[model samples]
Structures are given as structure tokens and as C-alpha cells.
Target chain A: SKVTSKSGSLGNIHHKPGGGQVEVKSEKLDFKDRVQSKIGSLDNITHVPGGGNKKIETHKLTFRENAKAKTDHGAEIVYKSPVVSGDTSPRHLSNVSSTGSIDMVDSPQLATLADEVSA
Target chain B: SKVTSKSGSLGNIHHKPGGGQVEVKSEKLDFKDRVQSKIGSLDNITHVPGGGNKKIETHKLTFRENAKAKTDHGAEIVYKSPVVSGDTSPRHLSNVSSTGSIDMVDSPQLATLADEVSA
Candidate 1:
């Protein structure tokens, strides 16, 4: 409840009592809203953007406790168990490495499958 | 109208019969849905996620024509003009790099700057 606002905008420094999966949590601050971030391993991949029809490696973006804003609508503070999810979203075919040739009929089906995996 | 569905899932291959800023356009298939992607220059920056308290360089992800789905709202073909907006949202203060150190009071401003840059 008062944990986060007291801590105020935290990062990978939060210490836990026991050890295991870091109970990463996201809650609206009670008194003064605090910022929080959860990130994982980087350097797994990279994807350059451009009109270069060249072949490249794969890349991905993952997340937790993300945000945005709006108006007119009031919000509330509630409690629920944490949810962890993964995605297999559409591949940037140019970045997908394969030893064979691929064709046009890929994304629609492939994307549908990937979306189901994460949605 | 018929250009894309005929071309079918395209990337940097679309050569301008002439040249210059290839008029990139996206309209649903007048016949069959087609996949299309836009790419750009890469190898400019990098950022790793996690509790690695060491300062790292910066990274950015920009885009165009992103998508998602729905249950029963149906949809419409929308087109007004080339709208280029930017964001000034919150950011992950961890990945920013400078000759000096930064703190929690940074993200709210930095992120807002980034959001506005390419909202």
C-alpha cells in the first residue's frame, strides 16, 4: 500500500527478504505516485530499421508495469494477482534468419499465431 | 488500390518507378489483405534491461502503421492526411546516458520529451 510511494520511483535496487522470483508488482501510488520499472536481459538481439532489403537477425521487446494517460474518466485502486505474459508476435521477416527462401504468404497466419501466443 | 494486394507482403523492395521519397501508403485489400512493412536505418544505440546499476547508452524505437485486433466492433477505412505526432511521456531513467549521473526526477521530463519527438 504505502510501500511504493515511500520508496519512490524504484529500479533494480529493491531488496527482497527471501529469494526466488522477484515479485514484480505494479500499483497506483497511494499518497504520491511513484515510478517503477522492470527490465530484463538485453543484447539478445537487434533490428535496424530502413529500406535495406538486406537479411538480418531477430529482435524482440518485452515489458512490465507500462503506462499512458487521458481525461474525463475517474480511476480506482484495486488489488489483484500479478500476471506474467509472453508474446510471439509477427516476425520482421527481414530479420528472421533461415537457411531457406520464404515467400509472401507468411505474416497473416504467422502473425495470428504469434498474437494468440501472447494475447 | 490494387498495388499492395498484387505486390503482396512487401519490404524495401518497392522501387519507385521514378525515385525519391517513395509514397508509402497503407489501405486494406480491395480484394485480399496483404502484409507490408517499413524499415529504416539502424545501429545507432542500445539499452539492456535489469538491475545492472551501471549507466548505459540510449536506445529508441520508432514506428508507423502499428496494429492490433478486436472482438466485435468492426472497422473502417480511415484516411485524412499524413499525421506525424510526437510524445512527451514518462521514460525509463535507467537507460539514458550522459557524462554525468541522473536521478528519479529525470524520467517524467525526459520521457515527455521523447513522446513529443515522435508521438
Candidate 2:
């Protein structure tokens, strides 16, 4: 009974480092006290799915880190769309273009259903 | 024996009503002679779905009668369709039409997803 630190139960226990390394030696130790010791101690608990604020607590103490290296870099996406027709029928059922694929093609289109007909 | 008629089986038999009714009886008769009794008899046969030619056979013979007794009658069927647009996009995607249901109205459509919303 040299020094005593009493938690929820089990007589008494606490955590402190000795020689820059974790240490826990106890006479009344219940063998598995990592849970009551605290969550971050090894296997007692895990972080959120994609790591929420609770995760940032371990990013080398990024929780209290406000100073970020500042710079500005940025892009303007450009796209030229086609002229839409005023047709309102089922696809290919009217004056609307069936040649759309050709207009967007880079080369002559591939073989057609005709080539599928074997002798 | 005064008379003896032998078919595929039994001794001898045929159908002849002594009066105006279908009769089947024989001195040396097999109990179940339905099939031998001919297809038009009480059983052992049937007709078509909507009753085609085989059906008309029992309609008092219409096949061999080709004289219509000279007469003519008929009627005209007409339908004026809607003016479909020249647009070919997906239905109601643009200029097509959502008011289609409105123009075809005989009554208000139905309930909203509201009344389903509990108080």
C-alpha cells in the first residue's frame, strides 16, 4: 500500500510512464485493465469508420492545430454541348437525328448487323 | 343369331334409335364402348377453342352452303389521331407532354402521398 489510485472498482490502479515507455505493474492487478485505463490504450477500442474528429485526436495532436501553410492554386472546366432538337417522339421515331453517333465519332463506325449475317 | 355385327371388339353393335333418341345397347356389348360409338357421341371427344370448322359441323351444316340469299350490309370505322411533335427525347423530358393525362381525363387521378403522412 505504498501509493494508491482508486478508479471505478477493483481496489486501485492508474497509468504512468517509466523511462519513456508505458508501464503497469500491480499487486492487485486484474490482468486486463486496458479498458478502465482508457480507450486509446492498444486494443480496448477502435476509431470511427472513415475517421471523424475522434480520429484527428491521433494525427500527431492535430486537434489543437490551427496554423496551416497557406497558398492559392485553382481550373475552369469547359464543355461545348450539342444543339438540342424540338422533337418529342420516342427515340428514332421522328425527325430527331439517328446520326448522332456518327457526329460524335472519330472514325468510320465498326461493322454493322449486316456483318453478323454469315453465309 | 337373327343378326350379328362384329366391330374391332365385342360381337356386333351399331347405333340406331328405335325412336327419336340416342341409344346404345347390345346383346354381346362391352361396358365402355364410348370411343367405338364415334367422336360425336356422348364422350371420347371434344371441339376447338372458339370452335372453328369442326365446331360448325354441329351447327346444322354451314360449310356446304355457299348461297347468301343476296344481301349487303356494312359500317365505317374512323379515328383521328393526335398531332405528335417532332421531338424524340424521353417522354415528358422536355417539349413532349405531361398534360397527356389531363387531356384524357374522365376523373381526377388519385390521392397524394399526403393522407399517408401521419399527423
Candidate 3:
């Protein structure tokens, strides 16, 4: 069976002092690497205290011709958060808007700043 | 096959000196009457030169269960325009926004006018 996939993002907003992360999973090889590349190329991500950042993940999968005949024949993605380095108090997970439109920092409002840096 | 029908509108906007109208037709009885009622109940319609008006028309039809076996099993509506009392020159038919949302005149901006009228 031919497999299909879609892209999505996950993030957390810190009100005080906290951070968050997202996880991408797929049956295809190097799904994490693809997600990492997208994150590295993402612009205008607002950082919060404790290294809070939004993350996007991508995944792809392939299936056998008879995979559809059996159950659990497709790939899945599970989102994880709060990649804490030390303390483990269970940081609250909060989701943000998932719209793929340009952010404020990526808008034309930053054109002058780019020009200045180039000049 | 049971026949089905839908409602729609037609209108014109006059810039200099003109007006227009719309016609509603359906195989169902009382379709024109329903449209006329909808037009009468519509609010916040701006009048243009030459008495241009917007109109809505609804229709409904019934058919035998076996009618679906044949080709002619559904009802249809045909929209006509430029209803004039006199004059032969054809008037342009212009379509406007169709989303059934509240217009400026129907919004809170007109609440003051309503209050004044009540006062």
C-alpha cells in the first residue's frame, strides 16, 4: 500500500521560567533529521526563559502492498515536551497556534533591518 | 428520485445612473413567493440609482422514488436579471458578496439609530 504523510508543529509558551521541545516520529528512515532541518530553517521563533522554543517535526513512511490488510499498517507521530536537562517536576505542556503564515519577524517589517546589515 | 433545490440572490450596484433586478424560477410552486418574502425581510440593503435591489429566491420540489431511474429527476433554478418597466437597452448584471454575514448597516453601528427611533 502507498503511504501518505503530513507535517505539523508543536511548541510551548513560558510565562515564568521554563522551556519546551517537540518530537517527530515516522516509519520512514531519518524522519527526525528532516524535522531537525525544518527547525533549523524556521525563522522568528520567540524564545522564552529557560530556553523555551517552538519546534516543528516532519515524518514519512512506506508500507507493503498487503499492509492495508492488517491493522497498525501506518506510521504515527507522538509529541513530547519539556526536554529538561536536570530537574524533573513535570513541566506543563501548552500548545500554540499552528498556522503556517509568516511571523512578525519574517514579515516585510524586518526588511529595513536586513538592508542595514547588508549595507 | 426526490427533487432538491437551493436558494440564491442577484443584484446590481449603480455608480452613475443605472439599476437592475433579478428573476427566480423553479419547478416548485411558491418558489417566487418565497424569494419575494426573503427580499422583503432583508435588512440594511442600500438603494442605488434607478431603484436597484437585491433579491433572494428559494425553491423546493418533489419526485417519485423511481424517478431517479430516469434522466429528469431533479429541480433547477434559473436566475434572470435587469427587470425594467420600460426601456430596451440591456442592463449589466453584477454579482456581489454572497456570504450570509451581517452587513455594516445590520451591525452595532446602527444600534444608535435604532435607539433614537425608539426614543
Candidate 4:
């Protein structure tokens, strides 16, 4: 009978470890409560303001008769001037050589004009 | 004397809330113990293996007299062809125009050759 009574006491103590009842009175000190308290600090945040979607107009002021940003790539541009008329040996095939080409075009106007001419 | 003994009992209950003493024997069930138990599960993780630092070579198979991936960009390539020899006026400045040019070059061979020729 005494052993059974002791087991019952043990069960009661297991369910109510030190100051467990008092924990209910100070629920704010719990770990989950700490997370909520930190979350409340988010009210201090302010979103950054805009530096987007605005554009400025522009124009060109200079022009030229014969200009080239690139004269050639992986190839030669043989012009018909007295410039190399006396070239003795085929101008040395002095064009470029490339392992690969760009395979992509960038300018819309140029692509449209090219298609138009091909058309 | 009975009141003092009751106060002592209350103190014992407060200090040893439900099975608190037994918690030491089953410490694995505690929240901090649960975290450590999960940490032990990391031994199962296997790191990902190599898909790095190996290369295969490549080469070109065909050659031609006139091959151009891009004939021109915002510009024209006027060939000295007797093919268009009898044009009365100009060939109609059939060149391209662009807002900007690509300021970067990609090919090491071409750039080195260009510099060498220029030199």
C-alpha cells in the first residue's frame, strides 16, 4: 500500500516540476513569448523610397562623312583607293581571325533595315 | 504548529512542481535536450560531389571564300564587286546606324592580331 502511494506522489510531482504553477502567472518570460516580443520591434522599419522608372531625353550633336566604329572583324575590308594600289602581295590577308562569332545582333534599326533590304 | 507545517508543505510544492525531480532522469524530453537530439541527426547529411574543372576541346569543320556570321552592324560592307559596278549614283549609303557601339571585344586572337598589325 505504501509503495502504491509513493508512485502516486511521484506521478503528481512529475506533472508539476518546480514552480510550474507560477509559470502561468509570468507567461511573458517563455521562449515563444520572447520571439513575439522581438517581432513587435518590426514596427520601427521604414521602406526605402523611389529612384526608379524616370528617364531623360537625349540627342546627338556631331556627324561625319566616313566613320567606322569597327572596320572589320575576322575578315578584311578591301577599299578601292590608290591607298594600297601598289600592294605587291595581296595585302597579306591582313584581316582578323576568330575562334567564333557573336551570333547575335544588337541594334533594332539595323536588323529592321537588313530585313527590309533582304525583302 | 499546524499552520507552520502547512506553510512548509506549500514551499515544498512550489519548489518541486510535478515530478520535477524525475525530469533529471528523462532529460532527453526537455526543450534544450530536444534541440541537441536534432543536432545529432546531422550525421546523415552527405555533401554533393564534383561537376567542376574539366574541359573538352572543340574545332571548326568547314571553310569558305566568303563567310560572315554578321556582314555588318549599323554599317555597310561595300565590296569591290564589278557586280555592282555600273551604279550611276551612290549605292544609296545602305549602311546601318546605331545609338551606341559595343565597346568590348571578345576574341583574344583577333585583338592581339589587330594590335600586332597596328604595331
Candidate 5:
């Protein structure tokens, strides 16, 4: 199930008139309550030096009304994973390369597959 | 001003029933037209081995209503920069480390400062 929360503000970083100067700020949006909904997850995999991979998992990210308030533009909603589990082996260091994939949900297509299977 | 576009569908990747299998899909959202709005950009920097650095610039990422439609969960809106301008020097690779900051806008604070400057 996908969980939705409007708890925190949107995160943003901005550049000043000068080329190298920047400022960072976040909006304090009202995170109503946490609700569980069906969400897709993606694992971005990057190869390590030895022969392993580093995966960054993105969960339950979405956009909302007024999300732009978080930053100068709008914001993207992403879930914070409390539990971290993955394969982390030092031997894979040689294969370390920053190239991974993001995994996510495919509701419509999945629904079709589910329907076909059921039939 | 923040330009809002219903644009392309949210992007998503999904896991299959089995543990190691996954699928990726994207929505076909209607991006009416591109608009110029105030947005914040963040630079996530990671150091390189030689001496220089590699920086990934994220612009105008935001959340919106039904953004979750993009993925199984929701999505984080990030702007794609057409002009890739940065300091990519091989000599500075030795100082590279994947530690950088995100800069954003502080509207209220900036507004106050702007008022003071005008006075």
C-alpha cells in the first residue's frame, strides 16, 4: 500500500543574483495525517568498484496542490524509508559505477495484467 | 510566480510479485505549455578522485495534486537543465567528495530584506 503524508514542507535551494551564492529554504506545509495508499517503488542501482552496487530507493513520491510553496517552484513528494536493507559488499568496489534504475508502480498496466491473470 | 503544468505523467518503476523482478512505466500527462516561474535550484556535489568535482544540478522540483499518478507513490518534480555549465577540471579531482548543499529561496525573509534595502 502507498502511504501519503503532508507532514513536512517542500524542500528548495535557490541561487542569488551573484553566480556562486545560493540560499536554501523549506516550506512548512501542513502534513495532514499519514495515510496508506498503493505506491510503486524504484531502486536506482549504481555499480561499485569491486563488484557490488549502491541502490537508492525512492518510495511513494508524488506532487500535490500548492506543492510549489515548498520551493520557489513546486515540490516533489517522496517517502523517507525508516528501514534500510540491501546488498552492500566491499568486494564489489571495482564495479562501482554511478548508474542505477528507479523502480515504481504501474497501476494501470498492472491492473490489466491482474485482470488477465484472473480471467 | 510559479508556472504549473499538468505536463507529462509522473514517472514510476515497480516491483513484480517475485523478489528480484521489476517493471518500469510512465504516465502520459498533458503538459499544456511550459511557463516561466520562480523556482529554486539545488546543486548536489560529489567529489572526484583527481581534483575537480562533479555536480548534479536540480531545478524547480515540486509536488502537485495527483503527482502520485506519475509513480506508484508520488513524484518529485525536477527541472532538466539544457545548458550544462559547471567546473569540470581534472586537476581538482583529488578534492572530490559527495558532500554538497542545496540552496533555496526564503521569500518572507527576502521580502523583508528587500523592503529594508529599498528604504
Candidate 6:
């Protein structure tokens, strides 16, 4: 079996007090490191506190092959170009926005920032 | 076969003028809906332009079973405990942050906002 899984919180913040990039790979891995340490813990780290005003960005994830995932929080999912080759069962529930606003105008105002990490 | 996939770009903005929640599911799902559209297009959405000042949040993702994925952004991945039963190969490239800061504080200041969408 082959697998690639990645996820995190916070990046490119102007007034960032906590959060940064992290990566780990091994046959077996288990550890919990936080911005702040706990009582009787060795992970006591510090920060200056506060980044400037900016946009609170969203999350991103992509997967293929036999996979199962669950997440909480508001999410938008688009199963692009799905196909079935064998007898399969599908069950889904979705909400479509009908009374929303749209404009066909200039370039997108919400521009994703230049990525700091390349992986 | 059963599958659940979700990804998006923004949510719960204080001074937000753009971005909202979206959900779609079907045997087949393919469509492009934006806050604004382009020339010779019907998807014209509008907004008031600008939200108040706030924290720029990060991303989140989780997966299980045989899956393959790739993402480019500063990502933190902790693959918890593994036992190999069959012939296998593991290939991974990761950067562990050494010159980082941590603190043992009373509480986490970077609190995740209450979700507006349920899925």
C-alpha cells in the first residue's frame, strides 16, 4: 500500500503569534509538539506574539486510491468526473446555494499567497 | 466502495467581503461556481468588498486506508504507528523544523472558530 497524507493550520501570517510548517516521515511515527509546552513536559517553546491584519485562509487536501476521511468545520467538496466500472453503491447529501451573489468581472480578488514550503 | 472527500478555501470571516461555504455530491459532480465569473459567462456574483481585521487561519486534513495524496504548502504530517505485514517500500522526504519556538502557556490563543457548515 502507498499513502501520502498532509495537513496543518496557519501560514504566511503578518501578525502571527503561533503556528508554522512541519513535516515528518518514517515507517512508524508518533509525537505531539505544540507551540506551548505542558506541565512536566520538555517542549517549552516561546514566541513574540501578534502578526498584522490579513486574510484567514482555508484548507486544502487531495487523495486517490482506496481512502477514507472525516473532517469537521465548514467544507466545500466537488467530486470531479467520477466513474463507476463495477457494481457499486453511492450515498451522498449536499446543500446547494441558490440565493447567493455572483459577478463576472475582473481578476479574482482572493489571491492565494506565494507558498513558503515546497513538498 | 465508499468515499468521502472535502476541500475548500475560506470560512467565518469578521470583515470578510468574499468566500463562503459550498457542498455538492452525486454519482457525478462537475461544475465551476465562483464569487465572480468571466466574459461570456453566466456566473456573475457580487460582494461588498472587505471584512474587518482578524487572524489568517491554516489548513486541515485526515485520511485512512490505502490512499495516495500530494500537497504543496507548508504542511505538518505525523503518521502514527505502523506494522508491516507484506513486502513494502516507504519513500518520504520531510523537513523537521529545528530552529522553531514553543511555549508552555495557560491556553492556546489561536482558537479554531465555531464551524458554520455541518457535513
The numbered model that scores best in DockQ is: 6
The residue-level lDDT of candidate 5 at A18 comes to: 29
Q: How accurate is candidate 6 locally (lDDT)?
A: 0.27
Q: Evaluate all candidate structures by whole-model CA lDDT and list the values in order.
A: 0.23, 0.21, 0.24, 0.22, 0.24, 0.27
When candidate 1 is compared with the true two-chain complex, its DockQ is: 0.02
lDDT of 3 at A105: 17
State how far residue B9 of model 5 sits from its true place (Å).
Answer: 33
**TM-score of A-chain in each prediction?**
0.12, 0.13, 0.14, 0.14, 0.12, 0.14
- Give the CA lDDT, 0 to 100, for residue B111 in model 5: 19
Residue B66 deviation, candidate 6, in Å?
5.6
Please tell me what DockQ candidate 3 reaches. 0.01
TM-score of each: 0.12, 0.09, 0.10, 0.13, 0.13, 0.14
For every prediction, compared with the true complex, DockQ reads: 0.02, 0.02, 0.01, 0.03, 0.03, 0.04
Query: Which residue window of length 10 is worst by lDDT in model 4 chain B?
Result: B38-47
Where in model 3 is the C-alpha error above 4 Å?
A1-119, B1-6, B17-119
Which prediction has the highest lDDT against the true structure?
6
> Model 1 - which docking category?
incorrect
Select the stronger candidate by TM-score from 4 and 6.
6
- True lDDT of residue A108, candidate 6: 34
Worst 10-residue stretch by lDDT in candidate 4 chain A?
Answer: A2-11
**Order of candidates by TM-score, top first?**
6, 5, 4, 1, 3, 2
Off by over 4 Å in 4: A1-44, A47-54, A57-61, A66-119, B1-114
Q: lDDT score, residue B41, model 2?
A: 21
**Which candidate would rank higher by lDDT, 1 or 4?**
1
Docking category of candidate 3: incorrect
- Candidate 2, A1-119: lDDT as tens digits: 23212111122223232222223333342323111122112111111111111111111111121223211131221122222223333332222112111111123333332211111
Q: Candidate 5 at residue B73, lDDT?
A: 38
